[PDB]
Design a protein around this nucleic acid. Structure first.
Ligand SMILES: [K+]
Ligand SMILES: [K+]
Ligand SMILES: [Mg+2]
Ligand SMILES: [Mg+2]
Ligand SMILES: [Mg+2]
Ligand SMILES: [Mg+2]
Ligand SMILES: [Mg+2]
Ligand SMILES: [Mg+2]
Ligand SMILES: [Mg+2]
Ligand SMILES: [Mg+2]
Ligand SMILES: [Mg+2]
Ligand SMILES: [Mg+2]
Ligand SMILES: [Mg+2]
Ligand SMILES: [Mg+2]
Ligand SMILES: [Mg+2]
Ligand SMILES: [Mg+2]
Ligand SMILES: [Mg+2]
Ligand SMILES: [Mg+2]
Ligand code: NA
Ligand code: NA
Ligand code: NA
Lengths: 63, 197, 63, 68, 157, 178
RNA sequence: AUGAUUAGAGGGACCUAUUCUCAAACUUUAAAUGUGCAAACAAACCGUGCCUUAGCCAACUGCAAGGCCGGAAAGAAAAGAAUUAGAGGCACCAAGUGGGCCUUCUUCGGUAAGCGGAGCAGGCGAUGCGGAAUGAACCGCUUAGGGAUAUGUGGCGUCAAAACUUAUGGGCUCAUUCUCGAUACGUGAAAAGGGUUGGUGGAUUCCACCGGCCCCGAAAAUGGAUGACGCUUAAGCCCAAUUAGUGAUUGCCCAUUAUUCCUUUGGUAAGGGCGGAAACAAAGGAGAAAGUGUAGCCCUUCCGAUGUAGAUGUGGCCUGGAGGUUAGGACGAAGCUUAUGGCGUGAGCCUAAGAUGGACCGGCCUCUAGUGCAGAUCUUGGUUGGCGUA
RNA sequence: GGCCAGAACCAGCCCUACUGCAUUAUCCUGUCGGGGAUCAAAAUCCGGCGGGCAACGAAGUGCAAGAAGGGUCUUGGUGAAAUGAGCGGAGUAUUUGAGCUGCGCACGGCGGCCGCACGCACUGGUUUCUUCUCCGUGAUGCUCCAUGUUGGCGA
């Protein structure tokens, strides 16, 4: 499935490009988020968001 | 470091061993810790939790309350089936206001002497928890019961009595003292009997 | 299986929440080679922004 | 001497320490005391009748169960 | 020092420009029932049964209806808890609240869909995500660039 | 060393809606260190020119434009920078380079050196290879004379890193401490 | 609109159209950030379903309220269509606090202040560690005790780990007794002006104008401070790299951080085993307790671990007596001495040796109290440097 | 020998060495015209036209999914459960990519006619070349501790 999906995207881009058109890529659905700061001096809203993201420690990472 | 803000708020105070010095309570706790670990019964689990509890939290029960609830269960119960064994992890006390009770099987930690006499004279029998473990090892066909604690004097004294909507008793040795300013409209003000929550 | 979780995560499948919620948050090492500036946005020459797919280089050094 | 009178500086922190507890659900503590008296009186009459109907319904249920 | 009942209400309890006047007939004719969600908005032209300034712009449930008044339960934080304050106002200071309009529409749509599926009728077509990719065929294609005239123009004088 | 800036073409548009069903497509040159920066600059231009925010727009394509073959050329760089004291200053400078990215990276280093102007306050209006006879400054024009030749004087030819020494005998290459 | 306000123009003033300027106690308009409510399980929806009511309505099968009887419930679709290190509720009994201070944005009084007063939020106080030479509060990171690896902030000429002074990177800069520069917070400056090399617009190389760096403007009291030396093909400033137009996207050095390994300890802890498995002597061993807590029954697993004031726990330590139970002592009790080892995270325990002593006393369970000292210008006794001094 | 040290292997970690897919066009090349410059040229540059892969290790552009030498005084062991692509047995094959191919269906122009870059289904055909694949061990072990090699020192 992965190989076929990438090949179909390649073909779609080639066909768009060959006629002066464009291929708008699908919006990414998944983000990978890693915390890059320690736990000091965090304001309440940011603290709450990072807790709901389960990013409670530096270099913790989620999808 | 990991941000665990007030993680100590989520820790709960639960009794996990008994403060009792009674060796027989300890034997019963052994028996029912084994039964709660090695069986699927919820009855054994709750019996174990109640067995390790403080005496204040094992409120006593009256014989009349047992009889009334066993009657409410007996109707809508097929007359083929036998009455359940009433189980209380606590004390059964006699009741002078109910002379006529049916034959009931009751298991309790302790019976008052007059309660035991009344139960036997009505045709029932008083069980101990080891006999119950022998004949109902998973508590099938039992009625777990708790005594009442809301009528306690300490409960009646809890909270400030001078705030609106409170009807707690004050800590006072002299009943006639503290019947003036704060309790009558003609003495400055009266604490309000009702307040919307 | 592992590839079931990988597929659910990667394609944002109908069990994305079940799979990610069922995992412990990922606990990563600091990026070998270091960062640029944790206090500046990636666009400003720092590290804290949305860096699109260059997050994969970052995570490769971290994983 | 002369010193600081008022500040609210640490107070929302303290209030959020054990959180701002949310309100009691509306279906709890919904006492009708003090509301419009005529409607209250009528509703009390209906409630008395409904208690009587519950008692009769339980009696009939006991009889019908005992029939089986 | 001054903390009156209506302290600091100069702009709060004031009519909007060219919108002065006594409340309207629709307000008189609206029926308020116990359990209705209402917005508490003070009408500055009445000055009877007017809510305290705190409750302006709060939404609560009606607990009581009197011949000329409405009892509303309003949440109010104080220290570490939120109380349920029962305020008494005249009906002119409440508006039928629209806070549950989307939820009522959703429930109505679900009942309608259930009825249609029971009847075997045609369900509406599904909306599609605009975020999926595809071919773009442009009509006009222009160069996006900074020119000299921009710096020339955004200088005054 | 190779230029620190790459040559990007970012093609994007506002997302089509009910108010704009076939939105215009914009092509944007920009010289940036990576494509994330290139798209950031593209959205800045879209915002400040077409009033289109990135939160309501699409990126149709973001590609590096390859450099041509390396030839000693003259480059006209039309460039602008902002400073608080003087506002926007636009200049047209000439550079000797071998690529457009080389000329633009050189222009950025030059603006940083002689005007203390950093990357994000600089907009490149146009870079263009021009013929020699259209070169205006003598410091660039001197470099395309037919008989251009010069010695290499005052050079600091450091040794290869492996053969570098701390102490050397005065008139030999005999390393003493290394 | 209300107030303040300059000037002309048209019918000395008035008017009419505006025009120069504007307000904490003016405003038509009007953000950002905010702030209420809702988003299906004691609820809501459907039936014109039944009962009840001294409720409303002229009556009603309509409206209101409480119930009963059922039906249906993507248990909340699809359209970006949430997330949770997301068990909610309810009590009881108590401590310390009730002098704060700093910073970021917003600010009020004040010429100003390391001044005084507020709002929001993070801090120090109560907290170290790494970094800014130094600093309660700045940057980084916050802490069981240990290793490895990798980072953060900050660095990579010596001091001082790191470019043994990196590049096969571009520019700019000269400074004479105040030392140019390398000073985030912050800790050395203005109005104004003039070497070099950049820009813009005109004129025939010069005219004006605008930047960069440097210079002048720039005067204080012990000798002195980019931290010191020094550095000028920088070891300075702006910019940009990672072994360099070769062929791809981690140069290097430092944390009480991150990852991982090992050990401890405690859980709102999570699981197993515990009916001796069968046999088995000396010239594979041993253990296996149904258990809060011990040398913890035993094994496995996960997570947390700092802390002033303060709270609480501990088959936690220690001292004088009592009820018990077990011991020891003239072949040497108590006390006392220690480069006197062992055990315990620790309070401490125990052994050894006295070339000490001379007669009582240890362990364990429970009971009990005048029960633990470094400081109170603490009490009493003794000693002591000053001092072979005045 | 329960002490010091050195080499071997094992298991687990940690550094290696080895790189495929897509993209390039504001690009590459030939020739006309101009324009340039010096003694004359060529070149730098601009428009056409015909061709195209700049293919060295092409390009410092996006994503990489490449199994198995050296480190462990940074761990524990020497087979007192080797659970394995690594051990022990069997087979010389299955099947997964790369190719170039069939039917529709999707997918791109002009409105069914073309194409189709190797998309989906038929797990299609082929196999031209590239892989190794298939079985096996409970605990009648509840727990803990006990097993190599070579010297040095120790009689
Ligand atoms: K290290
Ligand atoms: K544990
Ligand atoms: Mg750094
Ligand atoms: Mg900061
Ligand atoms: Mg005070
Ligand atoms: Mg207003
Ligand atoms: Mg208290
Ligand atoms: Mg204090
Ligand atoms: Mg320091
Ligand atoms: Mg060094
Ligand atoms: Mg150097
Ligand atoms: Mg220094
Ligand atoms: Mg642990
Ligand atoms: Mg602690
Ligand atoms: Mg304390
Ligand atoms: Mg005593
Ligand atoms: Mg004493
Ligand atoms: Mg002390
Ligand atoms: Na800290
Ligand atoms: Na240089
Ligand atoms: Na003492």
């Amino acid at each position: 499935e992965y190989r076929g999906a990438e090949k179909k995207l390649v073909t779609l881009r080639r066909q768009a490009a060959s006629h002066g058109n464009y291929y708008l890529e699908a919006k990414p659905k998944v983000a990978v988020v890693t915390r890059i700061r320690g736990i000091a001096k965090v304001n309440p809203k940011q603290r709450k968001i990072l807790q709901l993201l389960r990013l409670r420690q530096i270099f913790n990472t989620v999808f | 470091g990991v941000d665990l803000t007030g993680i100590s708020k989520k820790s709960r105070v639960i009794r996990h061993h008994t403060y009792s010095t009674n060796p027989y309570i300890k034997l019963l706790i052994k028996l029912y810790k084994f039964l709660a670990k090695r069986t699927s019964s919820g009855f054994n689990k709750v019996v174990y939790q109640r067995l390790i509890k403080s005496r204040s939290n094992r409120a006593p029960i009256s014989l009349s309350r047992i009889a009334v609830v066993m009657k409410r269960k007996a109707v809508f119960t097929a007359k083929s089936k036998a009455a359940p064994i009433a189980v209380v992890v606590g004390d059964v006390l006699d009741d002078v206001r109910m002379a006529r009770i049916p034959a009931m099987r009751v298991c309790a930690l302790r019976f008052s002497k007059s309660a035991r006499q009344s139960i036997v004279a009505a045709g029932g029998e008083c069980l101990t928890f080891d006999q119950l473990a022998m004949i109902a090892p998973t508590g099938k066909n039992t009625y777990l019961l708790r005594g009442r604690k809301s009528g306690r004097e300490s409960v009646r004294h809890f909270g400030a009595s001078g705030v609106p909507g409170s009807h707690s008793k004050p800590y006072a040795t002299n009943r006639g003292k503290e019947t003036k300013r704060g309790r009558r409209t003609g003495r400055s003000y009266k604490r309000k009997a009702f307040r919307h929550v | 299986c592992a590839e079931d979780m990988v597929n659910q995560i990667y394609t944002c499948g109908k069990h994305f929440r079940t799979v990610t919620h069922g995992m412990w948050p990922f606990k990563l090492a600091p990026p070998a080679g270091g960062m640029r500036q944790k206090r500046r946005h990636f666009v400003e020459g720092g590290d804290y922004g949305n860096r699109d797919t260059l997050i994969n280089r970052f995570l490769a050094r971290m994983i | 001497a002369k010193s600081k009178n008022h500040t609210n500086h640490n107070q929302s922190s303290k209030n959020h320490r054990n959180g701002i507890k949310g309100p009691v659900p509306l279906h709890l503590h919904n006492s009708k005391r003090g509301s419009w008296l005529p409607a209250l009186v009528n509703a009390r009459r209906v409630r008395k009748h409904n208690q009587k109907a519950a008692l009769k319904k339980r009696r009939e249920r006991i009889a019908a169960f005992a029939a089986k | 020092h001054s903390y009156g009942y209506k302290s600091g209400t100069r702009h709060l309890f004031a009519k909007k420009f060219r919108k002065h006047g006594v409340p309207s007939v629709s307000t008189i004719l609206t029926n308020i029932k116990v359990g209705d969600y209402v917005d508490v908005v003070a009408d500055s032209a009445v000055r009877e049964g007017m809510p305290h300034k705190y409750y302006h712009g709060r939404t609560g449930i009606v607990w009581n209806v009197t011949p000329r008044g409405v009892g509303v339960i309003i949440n109010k934080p104080v220290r570490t808890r939120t109380l349920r304050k029962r305020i008494c106002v005249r009906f002119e200071h409440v508006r039928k609240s629209r806070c549950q309009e989307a939820f009522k529409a959703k429930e109505h749509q679900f009942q309608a869909y259930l009825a249609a599926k029971k009847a075997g009728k045609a369900l509406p077509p599904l909306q599609k995500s605009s975020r999926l990719g595809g071919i773009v065929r442009p009509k006009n294609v222009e160069v996006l660039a900074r020119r000299v005239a921009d710096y020339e123009a955004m200088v005054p004088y | 060393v190779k230029p620190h800036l790459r040559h990007y073409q970012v093609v994007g548009r506002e997302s089509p809606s009910e108010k704009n069903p076939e939105p215009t497509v914009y092509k944007f040159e920009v010289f940036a260190p990576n494509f994330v920066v290139a798209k950031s600059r593209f959205w800045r231009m879209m915002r400040v020119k077409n009033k289109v925010k990135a939160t309501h727009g699409d990126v149709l394509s973001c590609k590096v434009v390859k450099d041509a073959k390396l030839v000693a050329r003259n480059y006209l760089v039309d460039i602008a920078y902002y400073s608080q004291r003087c506002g926007y200053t636009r200049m047209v400078k000439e550079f000797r380079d071998v690529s457009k990215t080389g000329a633009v990276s050189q222009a950025y280093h030059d603006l940083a050196s002689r005007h203390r102007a950093r990357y994000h306050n600089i907009e490149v209006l146009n870079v263009k290879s021009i013929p020699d006879h259209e070169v205006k400054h003598l410091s660039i024009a001197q470099y395309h004379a037919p008989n251009l030749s010069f010695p290499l004087l005052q050079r600091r030819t450091k040794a290869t890193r492996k053969d570098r020494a701390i102490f050397v005998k005065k008139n030999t290459k005999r390393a003493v401490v290394a």
